[PDB]
Amino acid sequence: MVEMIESQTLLLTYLTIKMQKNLFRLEEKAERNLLLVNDQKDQLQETIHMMK
Amino acid sequence: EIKAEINQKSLELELLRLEKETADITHPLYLGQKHQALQAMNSHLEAVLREK
């Protein structure tokens, strides 16, 4: 039983680490994808202010 | 979003600078004073042209 629960611990912690490394990679480019669209927001909103 | 409040306040400051300088020839207060001076002189001259 002690080797059985420590086989469940290894399954859980392996999955957590597999998620962390792939999820941080999604979050890293998700912020850059939002920043690349706020660049487009800022200049367009400012151009519209001059044209107003 | 701070840029929007900066730039919109700049436009109000520019419009109020223009009104401030043109005020003696555009603003109804000083145009009203210029009207009262003429209307007083007319309410004298119409009476001179009667009482001639």
Handedness of CA A50, B4, B8, B11 (dihedral sign): negative
Method: cryo-EM
> What are A40's two structure tokens?
């487009």
Phi-psi label, residue B11: left if phi above 0, alpha if psi -120 to 50, beta otherwise: alpha
Pair B6, A47: CB distance under 8 Å: no
B39 vs B52: CA distance, rounded Å: 20
Name the packing angle between helices B2-26 and B28-51 (round to 10°). 10
Measured CA to CA, the distance from residue B33 to residue B10 in angstroms comes to 31
Contact residues, chain A, for B4 at CB < 8 Å: 45, 49
Q: Which amino acid is at A33?
A: N
* Inter-chain CB proximity B4 and A49 less than 8 Å: yes
CA distance A12 to A49: 53
Which of A41, A43, A49, A52 has the highest number of chain B CBs within 10 A, making it the mutation to test binding with B? A49
Resolution (A): 6.9
